[PDB]
Amino acid sequence: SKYEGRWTTVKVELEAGIAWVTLNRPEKRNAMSPTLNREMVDVLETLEQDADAGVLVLTGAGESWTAGMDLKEYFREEILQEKIRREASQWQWKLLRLYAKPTIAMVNGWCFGGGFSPLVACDLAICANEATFGLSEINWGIPPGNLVSKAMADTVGHRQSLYYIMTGKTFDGRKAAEMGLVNDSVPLAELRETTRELALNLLEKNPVVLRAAKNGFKRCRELTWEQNEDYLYAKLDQSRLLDT
Amino acid sequence: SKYEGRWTTVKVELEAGIAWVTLNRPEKRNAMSPTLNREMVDVLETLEQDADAGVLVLTGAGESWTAGMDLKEYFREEILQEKIRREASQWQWKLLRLYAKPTIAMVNGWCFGGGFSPLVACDLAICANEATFGLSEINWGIPPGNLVSKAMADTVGHRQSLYYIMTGKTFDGRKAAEMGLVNDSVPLAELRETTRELALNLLEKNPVVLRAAKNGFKRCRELTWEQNEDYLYAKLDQSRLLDT
Amino acid sequence: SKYEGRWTTVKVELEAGIAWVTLNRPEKRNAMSPTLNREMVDVLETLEQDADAGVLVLTGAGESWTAGMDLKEYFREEILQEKIRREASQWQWKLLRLYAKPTIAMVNGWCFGGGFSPLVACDLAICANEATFGLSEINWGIPPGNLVSKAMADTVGHRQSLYYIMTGKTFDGRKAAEMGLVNDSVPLAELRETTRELALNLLEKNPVVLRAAKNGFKRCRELTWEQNEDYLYAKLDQSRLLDT
Amino acid sequence: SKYEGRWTTVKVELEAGIAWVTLNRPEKRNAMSPTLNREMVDVLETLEQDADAGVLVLTGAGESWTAGMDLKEYFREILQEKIRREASQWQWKLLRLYAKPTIAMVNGWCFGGGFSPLVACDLAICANEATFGLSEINWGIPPGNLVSKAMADTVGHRQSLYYIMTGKTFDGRKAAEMGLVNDSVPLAELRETTRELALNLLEKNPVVLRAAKNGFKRCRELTWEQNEDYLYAKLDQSRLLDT
Amino acid sequence: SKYEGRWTTVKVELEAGIAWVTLNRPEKRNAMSPTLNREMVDVLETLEQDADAGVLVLTGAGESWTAGMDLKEYFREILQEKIRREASQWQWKLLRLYAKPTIAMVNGWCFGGGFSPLVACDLAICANEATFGLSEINWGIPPGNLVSKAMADTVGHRQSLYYIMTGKTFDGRKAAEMGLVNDSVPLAELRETTRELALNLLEKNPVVLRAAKNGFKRCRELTWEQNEDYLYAKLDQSRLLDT
Amino acid sequence: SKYEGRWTTVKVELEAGIAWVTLNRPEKRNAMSPTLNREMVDVLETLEQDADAGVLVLTGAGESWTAGMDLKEYFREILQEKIRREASQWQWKLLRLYAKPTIAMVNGWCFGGGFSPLVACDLAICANEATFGLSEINWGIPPGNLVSKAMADTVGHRQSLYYIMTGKTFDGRKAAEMGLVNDSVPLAELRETTRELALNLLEKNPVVLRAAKNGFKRCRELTWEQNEDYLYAKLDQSRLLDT
Numbered sequence A, B, C: 001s002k003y004e005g006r007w008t009t010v011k012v013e014l015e016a017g018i019a020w021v022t023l024n025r026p027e028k029r030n031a032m033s034p035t036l037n038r039e040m041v042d043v044l045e046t047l048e049q050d051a052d053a054g055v056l057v058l059t060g061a062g063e064s065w066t067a068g069m070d071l072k073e074y075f076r077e078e079i080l081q082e083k084i085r086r087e088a089s090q091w092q093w094k095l096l097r098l099y100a101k102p103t104i105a106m107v108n109g110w111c112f113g114g115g116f117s118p119l120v121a122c123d124l125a126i127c128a129n130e131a132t133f134g135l136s137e138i139n140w141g142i143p144p145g146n147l148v149s150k151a152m153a154d155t156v157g158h159r160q161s162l163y164y165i166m167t168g169k170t171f172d173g174r175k176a177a178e179m180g181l182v183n184d185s186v187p188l189a190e191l192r193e194t195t196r197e198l199a200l201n202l203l204e205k206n207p208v209v210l211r212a213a214k215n216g217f218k219r220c221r222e223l224t225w226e227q228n229e230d231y232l233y234a235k236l237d238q239s240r241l242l243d244t
Numbered sequence D, E, F: 001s002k003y004e005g006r007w008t009t010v011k012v013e014l015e016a017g018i019a020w021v022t023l024n025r026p027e028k029r030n031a032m033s034p035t036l037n038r039e040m041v042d043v044l045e046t047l048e049q050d051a052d053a054g055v056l057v058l059t060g061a062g063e064s065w066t067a068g069m070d071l072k073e074y075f076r077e078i079l080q081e082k083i084r085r086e087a088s089q090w091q092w093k094l095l096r097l098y099a100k101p102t103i104a105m106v107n108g109w110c111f112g113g114g115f116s117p118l119v120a121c122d123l124a125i126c127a128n129e130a131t132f133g134l135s136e137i138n139w140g141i142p143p144g145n146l147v148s149k150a151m152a153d154t155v156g157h158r159q160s161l162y163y164i165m166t167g168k169t170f171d172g173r174k175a176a177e178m179g180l181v182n183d184s185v186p187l188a189e190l191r192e193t194t195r196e197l198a199l200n201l202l203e204k205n206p207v208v209l210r211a212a213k214n215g216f217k218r219c220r221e222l223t224w225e226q227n228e229d230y231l232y233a234k235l236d237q238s239r240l241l242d243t
Ligand SMILES: CC(C)(COP(=O)(O)OP(=O)(O)OC[C@H]1O[C@@H](n2cnc3c(N)ncnc32)[C@H](O)[C@@H]1OP(=O)(O)O)[C@@H](O)C(=O)NCCC(=O)NCCS
Pocket: A027, A028, A029, A031, A067, A068, A069, A070, A071, A072, A110, A112, A113, A114, A115, A134, A135, A136, A137, A140, A145
């Protein structure tokens, strides 16, 4: 297939304009190693230029979505660590959150802290009732890494954010949905199907418009109303120009 | 009556200190034309100085609240367009959001993107279970206009905001309420009544205080705690001075 | 006991690493007088250095949590008033909100505006179904004082925030929970018990980590994603250093 | 003339694309009254749509630019929320991000409230002879409207706070040292230097010049990382508006 | 005297409304120790409520302003969260938005941590002879507390970063070029120039001067559009607090 | 040599810890093309991990620093989202908060897009002879990428807007007046002055210097009250990374 064999820790399947992306260390519950961070940068930069990819789905192999950063690795370690950090950032949110194409997280199982940044950076998100979530950094004796805290701060109310961050307790899919972490939670049985219907629906939209709408909305969150009058019109006009 | 005949696209009725404002193009589902934007600036500046107006209700004629910006008009078109944009801003949020008197949106039917700015800029909002809402800019092939995105970003969680913005799907009143877009949703039958009870309740309050409370709260959202200690006390003291 | 007799308006009990703090003017429904503000600064600075205190609970004597600022006192009054204001700030949020140790509000009864700042500045919060809440500043003819508005703006959606601020209406514990003001609401009967279980659970955590996690999360709310990559890593590294 | 007789407190002479706008209450040192505020809103809004108007220059009749807001009026409610708003509407809400280039030509006394539209103008030329101060403090009031912020955005905080705190005056040469103006030239050559520059700005594609100047001013409020998005959005917006 | 003997590391002479506040460990070049921090909090809090105190001047005993934080102490936990907080409490949390005007009178060496309360003061006068540097870098540590931000807010980033990165020193004349002070005058006339100015600030309505200076400093953090609300709120607040 | 032949548009000579980095299309006045962008990303990323590299200097081959972005290319979509991103990636995303000290050594013409990596460098030395302008306006486009913001962060808004609006050029002496560089010295002594300073920066603990310079730059975006948390977090972070 188009990309079969291109990466060791990640696989990509194109189907009807959908680039399904699977994180591919099922035996390590798809933990995010530096290898996998470097490959995921490449996968995103590659799919950005591939005109057969209209929408991405992010998912994980086996029963993990991801189980967070690769533990048995941080233990290892240092100007190198600077660049290891940047390459986690590069794919998890620097590219993904304001991606030029629509993104959806399809959360099939374990999502554990670290995995929350790229979850939140996806435009939308469906999970399984049977998925299981955790900000268990605290039990391993660290505070959430990367933009995990910020992912939560934009998404979950602080009463609920701080409980889960400070206690380390797990929560099920239904609960991720109550808290507004995902758009919805459906039986695993119906997950891939439901995600796909949505994926197809977004392919129906003018993709230069959808970009400006979705990526303009995200940035407008950080600006004042009076600043946004100017920003969001500049993005409306930009959209007009890049379409014709 | 006091203001009967003063505007072509908007009507105003005073009753017990309540300025009921009706957008008045029912045959165009109260779309917001430049004419109607210019008149609504005037209506707000006029009602600001009218001491018989203690609280405003914003509502629309017939079965529309508003159906958003006037389509068959944007198609038309350009230094003019600059000023057409400003005059939409002037009434929809520049005057309305930090209005000197309490404001309530009474959403009786269709509310479609564009109509969301002045909906959110109103201090409070009641809708009918039977009203119907949409950010269908995307199906017409544009991103939300004016401060629509920002209206949503301050009001609805991003999972839900982006679904509705990116898909274009409609939602009913009950759902606007779940998402915190309105204070509540009641049968159309009871709407005008329920709105009025609330309107009367706000008339009971010292209006220089209510201003400082409501308009100070809105602005405090953009400031840090440490900045707000100084801002909100300056607004408390201001309130004291402008009252006696 | 360790601190018996140290303050006139506040009492402190240590038990299993928990500093239970009781506001202690039950006959004035624990209103917050300048005396009580000065003592609460001292109580927080004192408990910060006491290594037998791992977590704080904030609660009030009798049937009040607090009934807000001391009315019969503001009536009294002025460069003095400057310093009276600062000392309310000092304990209610300047020290409490980014406190070095975990904090929990245990809301046993009346909480009325003013009491909302230190409620929200606590990391977490449990209330009784039978507690009763109000932003009734408006009926007394003032806008919320201190950081009350801001407390609400960070916690409750604006539809709901502004209703309660502008109307002055009361709400019960169950409702504080719906609005995300508290983590949960339980019968008064089970309150002290439920709070304690949680308090013990947080004592199990590395306290230099918990600090950086909880106090880093709060501050990340005010920063952009790109700013937070640098901030939250600096806080991760800080945490590493202050632990060993 | 086009505009001759249209405004009681303001006078507007079009000449070679330039729109010379003269504050016209010299009997009051052009003090900024509620009347002069409303008219100025109109003037700006009229000149925005006048295609014979490429640049604006703002200057004062006589030996006065303006001596600030009208003290006689100050003296005394909801009506005050409007008069403030009208002061703002022209002195910076419209002026600072105006659709066309703007220059302040400061011929004489510029005190207090006058600093806002001074700063709000894209560029500014004064006279060696012109004299400024922030006298609000001597009148027993703190700088009003956006004056403080005008100062904060352009003058170093040590110098800013000397003049706000003492209310001492300064002349055109000091104005230039501080960064409050582009240059200070003898009153003699002031109209000439302003005209030269105004002519230069007319050479430029008007839509581009808009994006350039109005994008730069906003870009101060934004971080680099936010600005990558904003300024590129203004680039494309600029391209879209050309024909 | 009123305050004579009240503080071990600080000395406070009231004279004609002026409150001369002297950092008083000249044997240590007035190095800012945890003791001197706690006392300074008290001093500021005491002088806030003293109605005979209209202005403050902050200066150092001997030939030293301060040579920064106390290196002997630095050397070594939760207690560190307090000592930092106390350093902050006086050097800017209270000082920078102090209820009364504040002037730094810089008589001698001013290094490192000393720059925060330098900047935090509304105004500042130094001596030609006084010498400054940001030597933290030579000690193998980056500027501490709010030092960086002191520099960011007042000195251009090229100059700011030369001195933070190299740790080179500079004298009073350079200080003034950069905008770090209001002026640099021979040590001879330093006490005189400071007194003159201090006297001028006493002429002013105290409540108004507060609103004016403390509003200006905050207005830097805000946009124009936000500032319309903030500064008018400080205007009215100012009016309300007068009698 | 280590890097000799590794890059087609850029040349990198290591000498005594210093990493002289030369933009190397002198036939095009080192115009910044998509090729030179990609290579520059690589160069920076390579030099970050090279332990023989302590400082960087960025300079241009011939009598040109760079004359900005490559106009021949500009001319013509999703691919444009990448080429912009690559321009950004090196000119400020990596450079401005680079792990090692950075100096711009400006030997010749510096126009337009070149101002971003100019500003983004921690420090900068130019030649009396070198010539700059913001000519985008004459080309019928507004400053691109982060140029505006480069200017907003370092040059006073009056001067910033003169040069953005008119597109007039200026020489090395003006550059220094405005705060765009640290100094302007005869081309003759330029390499010497740059080397001296570069040598000085190598004296410093590298990890500390990082925290110091990169903390200072970020601290501009933050308020004092936020900065108390941020900068102390960078202090401790700095201590943690030393051995
Ligand atoms: C996800 C989880 C529940 C899986 O449970 P499970 O189905 O029983 O699978 P196991 O726990 O047996 O782990 C299976 C393998 O995955 C590995 N693994 C799981 N999470 C991992 C991580 N974050 N890093 C590295 N390896 C991981 C285990 O080491 C184990 O390796 P091995 O059996 O090949 O030696 C569990 O691994 C877990 O709780 N991880 C928590 C991660 C976390 O919170 N990290 C901090 C976030 S940044």
